[PDB]
């Protein structure tokens, strides 16, 4: 028998994932399960839908830990898992493993400038390790065999392990080197932590499934090997390990039929330099300027990502912005205004602002490419220096440039209101702080899409995160990994295999 028969009959595949194996299988700040291994898991699921000819197969992701993964496999709580599980000979007595998706060495994470340079320095020290892992076994064996008198703290997952080290309750955290780097990227001061020591082991990550299911295993292996030899595995590596990891924002849109328009709600979480976040709650209403027909949407959402940067040639207070937005939420030309966006469209943005009496103006210029959902803009404070952080103005500074998929084009209010345009009004509520109230007209003036805004901010705290300029210069809560592509992974990509190291 085979699990693929259980799955075809049930119509659902049940998939285990980890909670804190960064950046392989973990919860993003919206509780979505993401990561390098989750990308393989998504590919394997798509392969299952093809093999079984079941394009509407459902997926149920359920969380597992290093401690309970094998018991939950063995009693059928999930069908397979991909995360950070080491394939080794001992575990092959209980389970089967796919082709290898990553290779690691087990090392130490410690504060710079100590006496922890290698495993021998753990003598008489408090050392943290995650329950149920290969490192926990290795560390206890080392403690016993070399008589090192460590006080080993066994924590329930990798984030808990790391915060033991971060809080000073342990001097080092032993784990897979890549996962040490993942927990480091999430730390308050990532620059404070270094990975040290001779690897105690070399270990291969594989997907785990029940034994005696060669057909199910073969579908995994074929999928992994194809991702690896086609080069996509390396592209996924660059995404998770060499570029900023972003979390998209969801702009939730509902029709406002009585105003022939829409309303939206969404939350922005601005990174604060101390490592906290500053919530900005957005309430939005839009209504057409013209008196002719628009498209009135069913509920849906926009998935948004923005990247803020600096222009080296500009000494004025400024912001360079790239933005990528796609609509979603409905599963499977519509307006005259839609036709105005099939090419590249020039954009002009003008903002007048007053925040706690501090008056300023902003001018932005660039282009929009709605076919690809992309914006490129450069903004300048034309009145001197900006009295608020640039990130707090991003949402205020043209959702007509969203990419609507073809099956959703009847729901694109924003383009349908063009060329006469729409009024966009927001109240942005900054938690424990003040409020922005904005009113803008978004419309074509000649061949240019113009966003003309007036902003009023009141009730802000002079020492708060906004008027005190405590926000990081970024968007979408980026995480940046410090981890090089090793020779072992270069070799893996050219020769997929499923062998324990």
Residue 292 site contact among ligand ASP, a second copy, none (CB < 5 to 8 Å, cut-off depends on kind): a second copy
Q: How far is the CB of 3 from a second copy (least distance, A)?
A: 12
Contact between 134 and ligand ASP by CB under 6 A: the answer reads yes
Whether 165 contacts 189, CB under 8 Å: no
Residues 48-107 that bind a second copy (CB under 8 A): 58-62
Helix ranges (H only) for 108-262 are 134-146, 158-166, 177-185, 214-229, 232-237
- Nearer to a second copy (CB atom), residue 107 or residue 300: 300
Under the criterion CB under 8 A, does residue 421 sit at the interface with a second copy?
A: no
Task: Report what 11 binds from a second copy, ligand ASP, none; CB cut-off 5-8 Å by kind.
Answer: a second copy
Contact 297, 370 (CB under 8 A): no
Strands, E assignment, 219-317: 249-256, 261-271, 277-288, 300-309
Q: Work out what residue 103 binds among a second copy, ligand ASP, none; the CB cut-off runs from 5 to 8 Å by kind.
A: none
Identify the residue among 5, 11, 316, 384 touching a second copy (CB under 8 A): 11
Cα dist from 304 to 131, 328, 337, 342, whole Å: 37, 11, 22, 20
Taking CB under 6 A as the rule, does residue 37 contact ligand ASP? no
- Look at phi and psi of residue 43 and say left if phi exceeds 0, alpha if psi is from -120 to 50, else beta: alpha
Q: Minimum distance from CB of 140 to ligand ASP (Å)?
A: 13
Q: Where are the alpha helices (DSSP H) in 86-173?
A: 134-146, 158-166
86 belongs to the binding site for ligand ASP (CB under 6 A): yes
Residue 498 C-beta: closest distance to a second copy, Å: 26
* Closest to 181 measured CA to CA, from 477, 485, 473, 476: 485
Regarding 25 and contact with ligand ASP (CB under 6 A), the answer is no
Cis peptide before 419 (omega within 30 of 0): yes
Residue 134 binding result from a second copy, ligand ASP, none, given CB thresholds of 5 to 8 Å by partner type? ligand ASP
Regarding 176 and contact with ligand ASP (CB under 6 A), the answer is yes
Structure tokens that stand for 174 in this block? 């032993």
Compute CA distances 2 → 12, 180, 213, 402, whole Å. 15, 36, 6, 44
Instruction: Measure the CA–CA gap between 379 and 397, rounded to whole angstroms.
Output: 9
Would you give the DSSP letter of residue 446?
T
Nearer to a second copy, 257 or 385 (CB): 257
Residue with Cβ nearer a second copy (258 or 313)? 258
Helix ranges, 153-287 (H): 158-166, 177-185, 214-229, 232-237
**Could you say which of ligand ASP, a second copy, none residue 293 binds, taking C-beta under 5 to 8 angstroms by partner kind?**
a second copy
Nearer to a second copy (CB atom), residue 33 or residue 227:
33
Q: What is the contact surface with ligand ASP in residues (CB under 6 A)?
A: 21, 66, 84-86, 133-134, 176, 179, 203
Q: What is the contact surface with a second copy in residues (CB under 8 A)?
A: 10-12, 14, 31-33, 58-62, 250, 252, 254-255, 257-260, 263, 265, 281, 285, 287-288, 291-294, 296, 298-301, 329-331
């Amino acid at each position: 028998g085979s699990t693929l028969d259980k799955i075809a009959k049930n119509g659902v595949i049940v998939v285990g994932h980890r909670e804190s194996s960064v950046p392989f299988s973990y919860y993003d700040n919206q509780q979505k399960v993401v990561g390098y291994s989750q990308d393989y898991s998504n590919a394997i699921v798509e392969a299952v839908k093809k093999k079984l000819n079941k394009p509407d197969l459902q997926v149920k992701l359920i969380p597992i830990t290093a401690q309970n993964r094998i018991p939950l496999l063995q009693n059928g709580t999930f069908d397979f898992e991909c995360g950070s599980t080491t394939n080794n000979v001992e575990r092959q007595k209980q389970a089967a493993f796919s082709d290898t998706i990553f290779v690691v060495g087990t090392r130490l994470l410690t504060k710079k400038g100590g006496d922890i340079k290698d495993f021998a320095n753990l003598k008489d020290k408090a050392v943290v390790v995650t329950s149920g892992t290969t490192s926990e076994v290795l560390l206890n064996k080392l403690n016993e065999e070399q008589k090192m008198n460590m006080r080993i703290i066994s924590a329930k997952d990798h984030g808990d392990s790391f915060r033991t080290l971060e809080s000073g309750r342990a001097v080092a955290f032993m784990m897979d080197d890549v996962l040490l780097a993942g927990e480091r990227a999430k730390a308050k001061k990532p620059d404070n932590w270094e990975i040290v020591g001779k690897p105690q082991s070399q270990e291969a990550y594989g997907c785990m499934l029940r034994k005696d299911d060669p057909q199910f295993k073969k579908l995994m292996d074929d999928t992994i090997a194809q991702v690896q030899t086609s080069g996509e595995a390396e592209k996924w590596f660059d995404k998770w390990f060499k570029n900023p990891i972003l979390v998209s924002h969801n702009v939730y849109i509902t029709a406002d039929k009585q105003k022939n328009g829409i309303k939206a709600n969404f939350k922005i979480r601005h990174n604060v330099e101390d490592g906290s976040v500053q919530l900005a709650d957005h309430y939005q209403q839009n209504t057409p300027i013209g008196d002719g027909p628009v498209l009135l949407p069913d509920n849906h959402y926009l998935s948004t990502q923005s990247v803020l940067s600096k222009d080296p040639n500009e000494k004025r207070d400024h912001m360079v912005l790239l933005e990528f937005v796609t609509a979603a939420g409905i599963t499977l030309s519509m307006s005259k205004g839609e036709e105005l966006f099939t090419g590249v469209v020039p954009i002009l943005v003008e903002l007048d602002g007053d925040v706690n009496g501090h008056k300023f103006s902003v001018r932005g210029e660039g282009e929009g490419d709605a076919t690809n959902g992309k914006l490129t803009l450069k903004f300048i404070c034309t009145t001197g220096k900006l009295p608020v952080p640039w990130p707090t103005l991003v949402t205020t500074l043209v959702q007509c440039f969203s990419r609507y998929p073809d099956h959703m084009k009847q729901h694109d209010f924003f383009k349908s209101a063009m060329p006469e345009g729409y009024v966009q009004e927001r109240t942005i509520s900054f938690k424990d702080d003040g409020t922005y109230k904005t009113r803008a007209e978004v419309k074509f003036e000649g061949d240019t899409l113009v966003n003309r805004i007036e902003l009023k901010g009141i009730d802000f705290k002079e020492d708060g995160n906004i008027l005190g300029h405590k926000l990081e210069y970024n968007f979408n809560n980026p995480l940046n990994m410090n981890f090089e592509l090793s020779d072992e992974m270069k070799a893996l990509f050219k020769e997929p295999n499923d062998k324990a190291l």
